Amino acid sequence: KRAVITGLGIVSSIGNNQQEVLASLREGRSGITFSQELKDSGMRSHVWGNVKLDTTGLIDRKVVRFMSDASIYAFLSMEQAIADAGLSPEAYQNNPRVGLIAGSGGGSPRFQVFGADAMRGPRGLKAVGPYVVTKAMASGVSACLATPFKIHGVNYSISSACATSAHCIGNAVEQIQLGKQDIVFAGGGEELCWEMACEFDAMGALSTKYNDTPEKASRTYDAHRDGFVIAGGGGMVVVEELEHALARGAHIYAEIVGYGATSDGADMVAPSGEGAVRCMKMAMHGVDTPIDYLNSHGTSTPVGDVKELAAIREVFGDKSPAISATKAMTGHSLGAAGVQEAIYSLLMLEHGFIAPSINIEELDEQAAGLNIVTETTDRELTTVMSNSFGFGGTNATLVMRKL
Amino acid sequence: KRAVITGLGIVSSIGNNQQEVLASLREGRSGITFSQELKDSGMRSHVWGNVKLDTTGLIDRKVVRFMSDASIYAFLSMEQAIADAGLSPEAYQNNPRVGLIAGSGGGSPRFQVFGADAMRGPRGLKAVGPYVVTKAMASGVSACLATPFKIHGVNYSISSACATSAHCIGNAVEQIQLGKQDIVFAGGGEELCWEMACEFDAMGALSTKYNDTPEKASRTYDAHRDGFVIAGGGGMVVVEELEHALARGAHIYAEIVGYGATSDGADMVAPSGEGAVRCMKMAMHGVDTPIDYLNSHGTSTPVGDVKELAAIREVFGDKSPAISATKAMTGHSLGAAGVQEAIYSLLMLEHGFIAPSINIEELDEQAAGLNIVTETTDRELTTVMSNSFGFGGTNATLVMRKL
Numbered sequence: 001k002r003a004v005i006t007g008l009g010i011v012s013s014i015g016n017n018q019q020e021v022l023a024s025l026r027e028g029r030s031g032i033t034f035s036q037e038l039k040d041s042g043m044r045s046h047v048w049g050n051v052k053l054d055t056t057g058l059i060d061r062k063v064v065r066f067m068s069d070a071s072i073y074a075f076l077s078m079e080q081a082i083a084d085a086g087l088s089p090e091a092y093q094n095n096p097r098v099g100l101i102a103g104s105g106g107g108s109p110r111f112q113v114f115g116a117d118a119m120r121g122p123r124g125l126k127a128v129g130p131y132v133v134t135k136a137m138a139s140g141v142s143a144c145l146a147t148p149f150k151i152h153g154v155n156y157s158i159s160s161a162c163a164t165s166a167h168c169i170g171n172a173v174e175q176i177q178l179g180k181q182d183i184v185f186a187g188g189g190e191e192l193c194w195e196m197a198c199e200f201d202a203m204g205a206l207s208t209k210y211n212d213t214p215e216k217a218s219r220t221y222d223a224h225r226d227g228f229v230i231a232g233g234g235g236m237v238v239v240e241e242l243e244h245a246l247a248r249g250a251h252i253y254a255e256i257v258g259y260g261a262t263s264d265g266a267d268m269v270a271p272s273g274e275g276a277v278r279c280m281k282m283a284m285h286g287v288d289t290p291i292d293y294l295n296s297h298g299t300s301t302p303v304g305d306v307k308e309l310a311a312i313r314e315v316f317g318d319k320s321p322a323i324s325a326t327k328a329m330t331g332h333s334l335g336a337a338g339v340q341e342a343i344y345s346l347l348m349l350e351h352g353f354i355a356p357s358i359n360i361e362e363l364d365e366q367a368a369g370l371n372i373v374t375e376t377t378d379r380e381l382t383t384v385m386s387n388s389f390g391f392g393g394t395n396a397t398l399v400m401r402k403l
Numbered sequence: 404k405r406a407v408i409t410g411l412g413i414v415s416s417i418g419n420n421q422q423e424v425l426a427s428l429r430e431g432r433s434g435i436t437f438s439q440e441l442k443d444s445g446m447r448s449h450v451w452g453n454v455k456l457d458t459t460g461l462i463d464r465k466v467v468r469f470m471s472d473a474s475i476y477a478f479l480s481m482e483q484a485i486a487d488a489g490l491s492p493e494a495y496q497n498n499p500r501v502g503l504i505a506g507s508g509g510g511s512p513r514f515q516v517f518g519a520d521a522m523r524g525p526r527g528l529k530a531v532g533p534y535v536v537t538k539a540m541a542s543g544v545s546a547c548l549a550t551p552f553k554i555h556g557v558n559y560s561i562s563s564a565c566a567t568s569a570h571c572i573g574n575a576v577e578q579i580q581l582g583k584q585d586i587v588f589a590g591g592g593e594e595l596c597w598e599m600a601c602e603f604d605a606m607g608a609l610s611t612k613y614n615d616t617p618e619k620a621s622r623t624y625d626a627h628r629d630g631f632v633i634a635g636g637g638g639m640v641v642v643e644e645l646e647h648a649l650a651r652g653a654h655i656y657a658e659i660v661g662y663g664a665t666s667d668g669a670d671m672v673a674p675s676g677e678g679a680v681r682c683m684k685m686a687m688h689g690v691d692t693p694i695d696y697l698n699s700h701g702t703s704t705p706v707g708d709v710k711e712l713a714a715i716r717e718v719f720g721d722k723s724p725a726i727s728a729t730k731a732m733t734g735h736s737l738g739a740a741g742v743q744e745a746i747y748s749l750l751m752l753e754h755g756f757i758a759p760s761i762n763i764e765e766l767d768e769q770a771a772g773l774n775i776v777t778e779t780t781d782r783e784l785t786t787v788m789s790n791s792f793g794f795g796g797t798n799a800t801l802v803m804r805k806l
């Protein structure tokens with residue numbers, strides 16, 4: 001069975017819905033701002049890709065009481081995706097053929113910490129309250145969505161650090177391929193908080209030299225890049241079996257024609273490059289059209305950026321796709337990056353443009369021989385690819401093509 | 404393609420390897436002990452199923468520096484499983500056909516809380532150090548294993564709260580069915596700590612009336628049960644494509660002949676039963692032999708224990724299987740429970756016995772008319788079923804059959 005994407009939803013540093021996101025991608029607009037929270041926490045990195053949305057009252061009191069911010073962002077993204085897919089409650093609720101696979105990289109460090117802080121204070125268990133497990137547990141995002149949306153089919157999270165939501169989408173495709181589900185909502189969410197951000201800063205992973213000019217801090221492939229800019233948000237796509245989609249007159253963005261998932265088996269916090277080569281080739285297998293555009297993982301990290309370019313050069317030789325790292329605009333939403341970047345790639349495919357790789361003032365030498373696009377470019381695209389990698393040497397690649 | 408289990412490994416409250424666990428299961432031996440740590444934290448529950456193993460020095464410094472306890476337990480279990488399977492590094496390392504899918508329910512609240520506590524002191528980032536992300540991330544159990552074991556295939560965690568490691572095993576089976584992998588190491592780990600346990604005590608989920616008699620606190624189906632006894636540990640199984648196993652002269656414990664995964668879409672912290680019925684039925688589809696023994700999820704919770712029994716009655720009608728709840732001995736290892744219980748079930752199948760459901764002093768009225776086995780019973784078994792459920796209404800069932 002073939003799998004297609006029939007709806008999308010997104011809450012991102014560059015837009016609270018697909019219209020805002022589309023506009024930001026075309027304008028090369030930064031979603032990065034200064035964070036007093038990060039500064040106050042004692043961090044060296046004081047910049048972030050924040051969600052600019054008051055979520056007060058957007059979710060029913062009895063539903064939101066179980067949720068951390070990752071789940072809030074994923075839930076709002078799922079609402080958007082359902083509306084976009086034209087799915088009525090009757091179409092998707094209480095239906096064993098309809099599932100949900102969505103995760104987070106971090107879960108909720110904020111709520112893990114809150115539980116322990118509260119426990120150590122004067123009210124102990126009463127301060128902790130009865131909602132911390134569903135906030136803090138690694139599967140919060142799937143649990144907190146599958147329940148209120150009345151999902152009856154598969155319900156779990158994939159967790160693979162910064163590749164999380166890409167593997168969620170690939171696993172959704174597998175459920176369609178195995179004939180087990182007709183629809184799977186796939187994606188993820190990530191909270192933004194010093195509790196988690198400080199652990200990345202403590203390993204030197206985050207940008208620290210550009211706090212005074214937050215919009216210039218995330219600068220994938222620039223020779224003066226100095227680490228990623230942390231971000232939060234959510235995204236969800238509707239992954240649907242092809243015949244089921246056509247039969248209901250769904251709007252189809254693209255077919256997922258390739259999914260690679262591989263492992264480096266090498267280093268914990270630096271990529272081998274070879275795993276990414278294998279992952280991309282796996283996702284390309286049997287795909288009879290060229291890759292027109294590649295949304296790189298492209299974190300703005302000295303080692304990572306060029307390791308991935310070396311991998312791309314090995315896979316494509318002298319026939320580079322157009323490449324841009326949208327993280328230079330959006331920052332790195334960790335477990336939510338894969339689905340948000342799939343969505344950016346789908347919007348490029350749907351609207352016929354390539355988003356720019358911004359903030360390259362001096363292009364890294366190793367981008368020579370490749371097609372790094374630094375200006376918004378109108379172009380009819382047919383096949384797009386998006387890479388996601390995570391600590392632990394975990395790799396995901398998705399290839400999406402017009403029908 | 405057919406999937407078989409060809410090796411197993413376990414670190415549990417009732418033994419540090421399969422020899423010790425087999426002896427405990429046969430003896431009805433409790434793994435539950437009084438915890439001064441839980442009491443000192445201010446919790447109401449003072450009992451736990453602790454791993455009784457000094458793990459100091461068992462793992463290379465450069466590997467273990469990235470790890471939390473969940474990953475240590477899973478890593479040791481995976482070493483045992485490789486040795487049990489008879490796999491040389493030549494066979495399983497740097498092999499694109501060999502993967503790893505293993506997770507935890509909670510990641511590491513201990514290390515997340517350590518990060519935040521350290522950061523909030525006078526030394527900030529320097530006190531946190533560079534190892535907290537990998538110790539605290541949700542995917543630690545897969546990341547920290549796929550890397551040192553030189554895994555090149557799939558590498559990610561499934562997370563689904565108390566169903567986590569059962570969904571990991573089922574997803575491994577799917578990899579074999581899709582023809583993508585020949586071997587997938589599947590399982591999970593969970594740390595044991597007040598930081599996480601207090602979240603469950605705060606929702607009233609933990610046993611609190613039996614602290615003076617720790618070995619009696621976990622008492623699935625007993626009329627005076629009063630919640631679960633939290634535990635930690637790990638487990639790993641080698642899931643392997645059948646022809647690949649036969650060709651190498653593998654020792655085959657069982658074939659995974661069924662895998663159910665469903666969703667309640669109902670309540671966050673209580674099961675509907677309806678989802679469980681569908682999950683068991685899904686796992687039995689095409690399985691042409693009766694269930695000889697069912698290892699229930701059976702947590703020792705007032706609502707959960709009997710909701711699952713009602714679902715069992717609906718699925719099996721007038722032919723109910725022998726049942727036991729091994730958590731009355733072992734406690735509830737959360738994300739590690741699914742793989743550990745699959746392993747207890749495989750030991751029962753391999754050695755021909757049913758482990759007892761202990762501490763039933765007065766059987767719940769809603770458990771009447773079922774064969775809840777309360778004394779170790781030698782019996783030749785052929786087909787066994789094991790259920791795992793988690794918060795968020797996530798359900799998994801595995802059915803395993805002699806080849």
Ligand SMILES: C=C/C(C)=C/[C@@]1(C)SC(=O)C(C)=C1O
Nearest residue numbers: 162269270271304389390393
């Ligand atoms: C095995 C280590 C890997 C893939 C590291 C990468 C490139 S993936 C990522 O999101 C960041 C920030 C990195 O540094």
Ligand SMILES: C=C/C(C)=C/[C@@]1(C)SC(=O)C(C)=C1O
Nearest residue numbers: 565672673674707792793796
């Ligand atoms: C949807 C909620 C569910 C399945 C709750 C269960 C029965 S699963 C579990 O491990 C425990 C302790 C429970 O209470």
Ligand SMILES: [Cl-]
Nearest residue numbers: 022350351352
């Ligand atoms: Cl347009």
Ligand SMILES: [Cl-]
Nearest residue numbers: 425753754755
């Ligand atoms: Cl024996």
